[PDB]
Amino acid sequence: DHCPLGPGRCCRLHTVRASLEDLGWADWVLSPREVQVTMCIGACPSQFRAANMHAQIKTSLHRLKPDTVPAPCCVPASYNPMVLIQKTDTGVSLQTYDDLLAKDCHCI
Amino acid sequence: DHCPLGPGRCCRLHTVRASLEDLGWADWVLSPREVQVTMCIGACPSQFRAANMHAQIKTSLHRLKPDTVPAPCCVPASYNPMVLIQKTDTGVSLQTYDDLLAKDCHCI
């Protein structure tokens, strides 16, 4: 799957660095203080990583009715789990969270 | 889950009517000649049908870095199968297709 533009300018995994205060987590989360958020970002042109036939249909109809039908969007096909330490009402916990970080990307 | 604007102006299932020629299917597909494509369309504002915590993070970071991080997108949470009749190399078939029509929607 080759990107038209770029490559790397189409839907793919990016890392976005975010503080706890950026995330709105600083009251509850104690660590990590900086999160390396992996996320899916980039254009979804025709036949680029189409998740399924619905995506192809959206491509076709977006071209013909662009004020009505949006293009396919770059979204996570899967996630990577992540560990956080956070404050509880009565203590502190180290907890795994499964759908925080995107692992791979496709156009849907 | 109440939409801010609308309601119905946020991410939800729409029906878009499409001809075979619209879809690029007219060479192969014989019926139906008009498809009632159910698709997920609409804004994804804060806390609106967030699929998961990744979506919330995207909301937060989109506000702070809007040229870098896109908003959550309205995408199908599930699909409805569909029957088509189409031409083959050597004949014709009636075939079920599972991920053509969106069944419900969420912001991801």
Curated annotation (Swiss-Prot), chains A, B:
Domain of life according to the entry: Eukaryota
Effect ascribed to mutating Y97E: Abolished formation of a ternary complex with GFRAL and RET
Tissue specificity remark: Detected in plasma (at protein level). Highly expressed in placenta, with lower levels in prostate and colon and some expression in kidney.
Result of altering V83R: Abolishes interaction with GFRAL. Abolishes RET phosphorylation and cellular signaling mediated by GFRAL and RET
Effect in UniProt of substituting I85A: Reduces cellular signaling mediated by GFRAL and RET. Abolishes interaction with GFRAL and GDF15-mediated food-intake inhibition
Inducing or repressing factors: Produced in response to various stresses, such as metabolic and toxin-induced stresses or drugs. Expression is activated by ATF4 and DDIT3/CHOP transcription factors downstream of the integrated stress response (ISR). Expressed in response to inflammatory conditions. Expression is induced by metformin, a blood-glucose-lowering drug. Expression is induced by cisplatin anticancer drug. Also induced by physical activity. Expression is up-regulated by obesity. Expression is up-regulated by ketogenic diet.
Localization per Swiss-Prot or TrEMBL: Secreted
Disulfide bonds: C3-C10, C11-C74, C40-C105, C44-C107
Extra remark beyond the main annotation: GDF15 was initially considered as a promising factor for the treatment of obesity due to its ability of GDF15 to reduce appetite and promote weight loss. However, while activation of the GDF15-GFRAL signaling pathway is efficient to reduce obesity and promote weight loss in mouse, it only has limited effect in human.
Record function comment: Hormone produced in response to various stresses to confer information about those stresses to the brain, and trigger an aversive response, characterized by nausea, vomiting, and/or loss of appetite. The aversive response is both required to reduce continuing exposure to those stresses at the time of exposure and to promote avoidance behavior in the future. Acts by binding to its receptor, GFRAL, activating GFRAL-expressing neurons localized in the area postrema and nucleus tractus solitarius of the brainstem.
Assembly and interaction partners: Homodimer; disulfide-linked. Interacts with GFRAL and RET; ligand of GFRAL, which mediates GDF15 internalization and cellular signaling through interaction with RET via the formation of a 2:2:2 ternary complex composed of GDF15, GFRAL and RET.
Stated family: Belongs to the TGF-beta family.
Disease per record: Hyperemesis gravidarum: An autosomal dominant condition characterized by severe nausea and vomiting in pregnancy. It occurs in up to 2% of pregnancies and leads to significant weight loss, dehydration, electrolyte imbalance, and ketonuria. It is associated with both maternal and fetal morbidity.
Protein name (record): Growth/differentiation factor 15
Source organism phylogeny: Eukaryota, Metazoa, Chordata, Craniata, Vertebrata
Location of this fragment in the whole protein: 201 to 308 of 308
